[PDB]
């Protein structure tokens, strides 16, 4: 029926903003400073 990749690695940090995983609490930080711009779309939590 259906099948795909399970995810051997572990992504304890995800970026819902875009949808990418990060295996580093530090790396994600620098990345978090990317979706700052106030997109034309309404937020979700502030
Ligand atoms: Zn992101």
Curated annotation (Swiss-Prot):
Official protein name in the record: Zinc finger protein 224
UniProt zinc finger (C2H2-type) residues: 13-35
Annotated localization: Nucleus
Family according to the record: Belongs to the krueppel C2H2-type zinc-finger protein family.
Source species, domain of life: Eukaryota
Oligomeric form and interacting partners: Interacts with WT1. Interacts with DEPDC1A.
Segment of the intact protein contained: 507 to 539 of 707
Disulfide bonds: none
Tissues in which the protein is found: Ubiquitous. Mainly expressed in fetal tissues.
Summary of the function given for this chain in its UniProt record: May be involved in transcriptional regulation as a transcriptional repressor. The DEPDC1A-ZNF224 complex may play a critical role in bladder carcinogenesis by repressing the transcription of the A20 gene, leading to transport of NF-KB protein into the nucleus, resulting in suppression of apoptosis of bladder cancer cells.
